[PDB]
Design a binder for these strands. Structure first.
Ligand code: NA
Ligand code: NA
Ligand code: NA
Ligand code: NA
Ligand code: NA
Length: 1043
RNA sequence: GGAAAUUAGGUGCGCUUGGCGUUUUAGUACUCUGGAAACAGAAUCUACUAAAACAAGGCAAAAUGCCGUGUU
DNA sequence: CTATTCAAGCCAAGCGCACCTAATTTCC
DNA sequence: TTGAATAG
């Protein structure tokens, strides 16, 4: 049957709506659900990847320095340097002699923390911030007479500490100390100039951004040329050709020639510049003046500036003409004709200056050119600035039409069209379905990319199961991500409180309880300063409250063409003004004789109302002062493109992808989009539940509303004009009044089919990806009690924070948990006194320090004890963990990491009893082209679960896999507790959190199921991308994961 | 709507670093014991400094060495 | 078992290219 | 949101 497809593309969801194109009856509707592909996910990976390289290279830097000391025999395996103080050694080495153990440790400490190199350039006024820029500037003034080690030693004696925010210095500052130290220590130890050069190098040398990682990395490159070429784009007309450097000579000549060919001169002779004219212009003002003006070109062609038009212009109004960058950059230092008049050479210099990133590399590459350049010239060209970026065309494209630009008057696009050169496009004829590879090409956000890919896959599945639809209407989220979404919600709620407080203010002042039914009119009243905007006459609030029917909410721009139902297109005016106005703009109405005031008097009031705090909306201003003609089709097109349809870049890209696919394969499918503001208006007037608490079905419900919107536009012949623009087809009946507009769209009783629908499907995206986060980062120390139990040791930092009552609750509930309670009890009593004194306050340590300005100090009979920055306390008993004690030699206690992230769990049926084996991410090992589950770890866990060889393997469960526990179907979150056989799940049509809120249930919003002897039945279900359920069957547990 | 250019702003991918943070051990301080002091012993709580480890781990061999939390 | 509790690495500096938005000129 | 321990 012929149907209409509606799509609600969201951050997390894709809702589809399938309704009959004639019967208007809902065929099917459901939601596809998935994780938000927000940028922070990949950012975490890249951040961790970078962190590993830093730690690796820092270590490798040290090992090389130790190797240097080994080869010069200042360090051995027997040589001990434990009790040596680097700060004491580095200071002593600047003046006196050092031991081979004392001098070596000084060099090692320098090599470890070598400081910054790039920030050091510019000073910054200390705005009391802890930024690197301000800190470097701060230390520089303190190092005006002292070396780094001297300053650190002073801080170590005076403040008792060195490490922290203040320990940020320039690399050159450390190097300046190192040289001085090496200069003093040179005579005492047998070293050469190779030793001092090598160490200083090692101390300061770091890879550049264009050098990248070493030889092995898949993120690396072999040279600067390969590096830049892979990054740069390709030509528009020659896809196989790499783009040209932005500031090549022929590139700017191409730019300049286009400027001259676009010029129009009003004179007796030709209006377009002749060849010889452009030649003279190029030679006399373009190759002579860096920034060509309109006067110079006018003086050259012997006309006035006023006769010249069609030139590019800046925001100021000043004419903009192409600057010959390379020409003037080289001319300013070399005026030789051998170089300047060599276009090919200037091209090559431009390429080298742009591709390579350092003066030294420029010099070498320019020298390899074997041109007529002097070495003094080359070393001078290598310091030129601004050579960055690419041209959108290749040199092949530029050189091809360069003669055409000289001798003709056609610009680049005219010539390319004449030469039958069409921009690169992707063919979709060999495609059996809508591709998903092209998505990342025209996308900007990772969130949108996933939502688009899923949306396409939904469409492909729909057209496979239901056939091709005639109409596809799509809506996209207004938010770019969930963080932006919450921000919108907060702003919404804030405005709601303000308006609600405003209403309560009125009902308490006037006593009129009518105010709660006049919110929109009251909101307009305050926004218009109590004045009818069409008559500029005062609107008494008391009269508005008593007689609201005398004041009408009018639409500024008629919705028949504007399709705007928002607050921005609404004004509170007197009923007379709204009647006389009719279907016109304020401009069209106030210009007529039907009005009481002039448009100019109106325009003045609006502009002053649009300025200042609490001003009118900016969109309201553009509406109230609309001076274009409504009946013009071009004007109507702009309103539809803004308020009715969605013309955002992402939307257009996807919409073009679909239209191009259907066009190429000759498939008669009409694709369109719709603004969310209009669908919200429909949902509002069609009387849907304002509180969206039904769960995921709202996405599918929205899609049905969107699909219904498409149906309305095909039914009415007055909407045929607007419907044609939505489908973007080339080219009449129309909506004439406000009343006609309401009759068409506001049809609550005609959409009862949607609300009665109770057959929604749901599809949750299953995550089977190996090698995600294996474990939490935090390292934990352990202790053993008298019972022989191993206990986890936790830290309690930030004791002096305002809203931190962790210590307060800890002492009140379990004082014995503190390690301070057992060891050093005198300090504990000192803390208890502070705790007992501020029991009313949230954080006793906060209120204490907020008054005395002093912190809690360790007990000392001389009142000189150290400050307490954090407190250790015993946590839970150690169980599931990762033992990494071996990384710490002679450690008295275990050192562990916690939270072993589960990959999946395999359910076994063992002698009428359901059991399962938990597969951890740590248990999945990567190989060259595939991931394998550790067979030793699997059998081990299979033994720790009392699984027998007789047991029957049921199924494996990953995240968002559908599991049916005792007749109840859930979706899998993951293994919550391996030892206790507890897995966490969630509901399918809704979140369990919201499910409890609707039921007003105060229980903790987590569903934990226990797989034990009481467990009766376990079945694995699954869905397609549409949400159609089906049961599965398997023979053995999957061990090989292809990735 | 599309082509090129100028300016301003924005997004992503990738690269290069900085100073922190967690943990162990050692030293010191703090606490306890003895002593006239020196110092020794105990404790490992609190702080400071150094060295080392920091997703499990896998390559690599004198290296500005390399991979391991993303997408599909 | 249910109901409850705890806690989970972080800031700052620079660079390359790709893409997008807005404004301006020409043409297709 | 989620590993996972813990009181009852
Ligand atoms: Na490329
Ligand atoms: Na550059
Ligand atoms: Na008038
Ligand atoms: Na950027
Ligand atoms: Na807890």
């Amino acid at each position: 049957r012929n149907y209409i497809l509606g799509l609600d593309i969201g951050i997390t969801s894709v809702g589809y709506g399938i309704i009959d194109y004639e019967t208007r009856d809902v065929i099917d509707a459901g939601v596809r659900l998935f994780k938000e592909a927000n940028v922070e996910n990949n950012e975490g990976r890249r951040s961790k990847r970078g962190a590993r390289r830093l730690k690796r290279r820092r270590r490798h830097r040290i090992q090389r320095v130790k190797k240097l000391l080994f080869d010069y025999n200042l360090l051995t395996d027997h040589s001990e340097l434990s009790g040596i103080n680097p700060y004491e050694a580095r200071v002593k080495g600047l003046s006196q002699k050092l031991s081979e153990e004392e001098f070596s440790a000084a060099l090692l400490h320098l090599a470890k923390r070598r400081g910054v190199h790039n920030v050091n350039e510019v000073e910054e006024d200390t705005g009391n911030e802890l930024s690197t820029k301000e800190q470097i500037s701060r230390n520089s003034k303190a190092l005006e007479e002292k070396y780094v080690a001297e300053l650190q030693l002073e801080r170590l004696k005076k403040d008792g500490e060195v490490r922290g925010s203040i320990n940020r210095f320039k690399t050159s500052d450390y190097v300046k100390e190192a040289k001085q130290l090496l200069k003093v220590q040179k005579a005492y130890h047998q070293l050469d100039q190779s030793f001092i050069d090598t160490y200083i190098d090692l101390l300061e040398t770091r890879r550049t951004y264009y050098e990248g990682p070493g030889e092995g990395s898949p993120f690396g490159w072999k040279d600067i040329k390969e590096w830049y070429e892979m990054l740069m784009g390709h030509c528009t007309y020659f896809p196989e050709e790499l783009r040209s450097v932005k500031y090549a000579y022929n590139a700017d000549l191409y730019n300049a020639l286009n400027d001259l060919n676009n010029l129009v001169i009003t004179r007796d002779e030709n209006e377009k510049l002749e060849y010889y004219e452009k030649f003279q212009i190029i030679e006399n003002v373009f190759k002579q003046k860096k920034k060509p003006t309109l006067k110079q070109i006018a003086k050259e062609i012997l006309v006035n500036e006023e006769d010249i038009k069609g030139y590019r212009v800046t925001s100021t109004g000043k004419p903009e003409f192409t600057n010959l960058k390379v020409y003037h950059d080289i001319k300013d230092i070399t005026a030789r004709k051998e170089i300047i008049e060599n276009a090919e050479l200037l091209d090559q210099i431009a390429k080298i200056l742009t591709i390579y990133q350092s003066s030294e590399d420029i010099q070498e590459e320019l020298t390899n050119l074997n041109s007529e350049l002097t070495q003094e010239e080359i070393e001078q060209i290598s310091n030129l600035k601004g050579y960055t970026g690419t041209h959108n065309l290749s040199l092949k494209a530029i050189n091809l039409i360069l003669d055409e630009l000289w001798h003709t008057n056609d610009n680049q696009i005219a010539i390319f069209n004449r030469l039958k050169l069409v921009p690169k496009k992707v063919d979709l004829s060999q495609q059996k379905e809508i591709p998903t590879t092209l998505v990342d090409d025209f996308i900007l956000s990772p969130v949108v990319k996933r939502s688009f890919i899923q949306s396409i896959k939904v469409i492909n599945a729909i057209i496979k199961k239901y056939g091709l639809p005639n109409d596809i209407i799509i809506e996209l989220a207004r938010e770019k991500n969930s963080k932006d979404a919450q921000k919108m919600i907060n702003e919404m709620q804030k405005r709601n409180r303000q308006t609600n407080e405003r209403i309560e203010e009125i009902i308490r002042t006037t006593g009129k309880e009518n105010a709660k039914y006049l919110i929109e009119k009251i909101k307009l009243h305050d926004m218009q300063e109590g004045k009818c905007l069409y008559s500029l006459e005062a609107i008494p609030l008391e009269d508005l409250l008593n007689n609201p029917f005398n004041y009408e909410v009018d639409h500024i721009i008629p919705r028949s063409v504007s399709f705007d139902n928002s607050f921005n297109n609404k004004v509170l005016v007197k009923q007379e003004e709204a009647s006389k106005k009719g279907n016109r703009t304020p401009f069209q109405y106030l210009s007529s004789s039907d009005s009481k005031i002039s448009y100019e008097t109106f325009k003045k009031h609006i502009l002053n109302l649009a300025k200042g705090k609490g001003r009118i909306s900016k969109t309201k201003k553009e509406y109230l002062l609309e001076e274009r003609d409504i009946n013009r089709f071009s004007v109507q097109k702009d309103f539809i493109n803004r308020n009715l349809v969605d013309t955002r870049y992402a939307t257009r890209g996807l919409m073009n992808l679909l239209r191009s696919y259907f066009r190429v394969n000759n498939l008669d499918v009409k694709v369109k989009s719709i603004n969310g503001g209009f669908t919200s208006f429909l949902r509002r007037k069609w009387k849907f539940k304002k509180e969206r608490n039904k769960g995921y079905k709202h996405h599918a419900e929205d899609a049905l509303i969107i699909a219904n919107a498409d149906f309305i536009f095909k039914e009415w012949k007055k909407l045929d004009k607007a419907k044609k623009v939505m489908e973007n087809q080339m080219f009449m009946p129309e909506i004439e009044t406000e009343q006609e507009y309401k009759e068409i769209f506001i049809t609550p009783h005609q959409i009862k089919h949607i609300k009665d629908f109770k057959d929604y499907k749901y599809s949750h995206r299953v995550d089977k990806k190996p090698n995600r986060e294996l474990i939490n980062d935090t390292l934990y120390s352990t202790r053993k009690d008298d019972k022989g139990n191993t206990l986890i040791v936790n830290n309690l930092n930030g004791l002096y924070d305002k809203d931190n009552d962790k210590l307060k609750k800890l002492i009140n509930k379990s004082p014995e948990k503190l390690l301070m309670y057992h060891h050093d009890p005198q300090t504990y009593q000192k803390l208890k006194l502070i705790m007992e004194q501020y029991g009313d306050e949230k954080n006793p340590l906060y209120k204490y320090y907020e008054e005395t300005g002093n912190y809690l100090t360790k007990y000392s009979k001389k009142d000189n004890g150290p400050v307490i920055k954090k407190i250790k306390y015993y946590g839970n008993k150690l169980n599931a963990h990762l033992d990494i004690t071996d990384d710490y030699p002679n450690s008295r206690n275990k050192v562990v990491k916690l939270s072993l992230k589960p990959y999946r769990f395999d359910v076994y049926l063992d002698n009428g009893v359901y059991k399962f084996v938990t597969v951890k991410n740590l248990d999945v090992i990567k190989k060259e082209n595939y991931y394998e589950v550790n067979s030793k770890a699997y059998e081990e866990a299979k033994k720790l679960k009392k699984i027998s060889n007789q047991a029957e393997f049921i199924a494996s469960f990953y995240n968002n896999d559908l599991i049916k526990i005792n007749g109840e179907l859930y979706r899998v979150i993951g293994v919550n507790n391996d030892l206790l056989n507890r897995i966490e799940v969630n509901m399918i049509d809704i979140t369990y959190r919201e499910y409890l809120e609707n039921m007003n249930d105060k229980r903790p919003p987590r569903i934990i199921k226990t797989i034990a002897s009481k467990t009766q039945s376990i079945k694995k279900y699954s869905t397609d991308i549409l949400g159609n359920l089906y049961e599965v069957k398997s023979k053995k547990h999957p061990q090989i994961i292809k990735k």
